[PDB]
Design a binder for this molecule. Structure first.
Ligand code: NA
Ligand code: NA
Lengths: 158, 158
């Protein structure tokens, strides 16, 4: 069976109004899986997308690591929007795809792209790289048609 | 074009050894999207799955909200494991599906399941519910074949 259909024989709510479901919900109880194991004070907050999906933000406190954690995704109705059966997608940095397009012999410096030229990263085993490595990486990116003026260079420790 | 193929005309590394790529990488630079906007001190840590995919954990500091944030997902080769082109899936609480199977007239208390009877939540607009609402929610779950002994009831404020 699909991961985007309900369990066999389980009936879903059939007069759902997503507008009244928006906002914050407290998780009272869960069946445990790896992702939520040990989380406390868990909430989910739903908002309506321009395209008719729901966006959601999940928040919970991890007592082990002593810090708040969060997750973001979207959900789309699989049928009529009055039937509360939805398909879920979680958000993250590397949308759609992860393609290594440059890599040194020693696996120290990588240029990684997504599914089109709007998705590009420079990754390193070290928090800083030499201007020489920056210039080599920017040359490969430019030669393959990425606009390297779009880079946000990330704050890292000295 | 697919979100799980590289940009047109971009060539990927073709003698990739995922074993040498494992462990921690620092994000030196990114093209900005909603998910990473404003994040500092960003890393990704790769590990090998039993099924041949890569697991990854992304970590970054959000200076706005003054706290560390993290994200988890997996990536699978789309072809030969020596061609560094991968499809990405992010992890979260509500795997595969989100199905509302019980809801009161006032949109205050919900029973929500995933794609099989191993996925179940009780959600509330309030951090606590009455034993009456607990018993109503557990009765519906039991009547539809969920093992309500699997619930972890979540710590919430009084
Ligand atoms: Na492109
Ligand atoms: Na089932």
């Amino acid at each position: 069976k699909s991961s985007s259909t309900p369990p066999r024989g389980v009936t879903v709510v059939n007069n759902f109004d997503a507008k009244r479901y928006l906002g914050t919900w407290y998780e009272i109880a869960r069946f445990d899986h790896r992702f939520e194991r040990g989380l406390e004070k868990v909430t989910a907050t739903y908002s309506l997308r321009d395209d008719g999906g729901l966006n959601f933000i999940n928040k919970g406190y991890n007592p082990d690591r002593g810090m708040w954690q969060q997750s973001e995704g979207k959900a789309y109705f699989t049928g009529a929007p009055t039937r509360a059966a939805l398909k879920v997608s979680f958000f993250g940095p590397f949308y759609g795809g992860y393609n290594v397009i440059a890599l040194d012999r020693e696996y120290r410096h990588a240029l990684v792209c997504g599914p089109d030229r709007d998705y590009l990263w420079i990754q390193s085993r070290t928090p800083t790289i030499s201007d020489e490595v920056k210039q080599e990486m920017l040359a490969v990116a430019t030669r393959e048609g990425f606009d390297v003026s779009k880079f946000i260079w990330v704050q890292q420790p000295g």
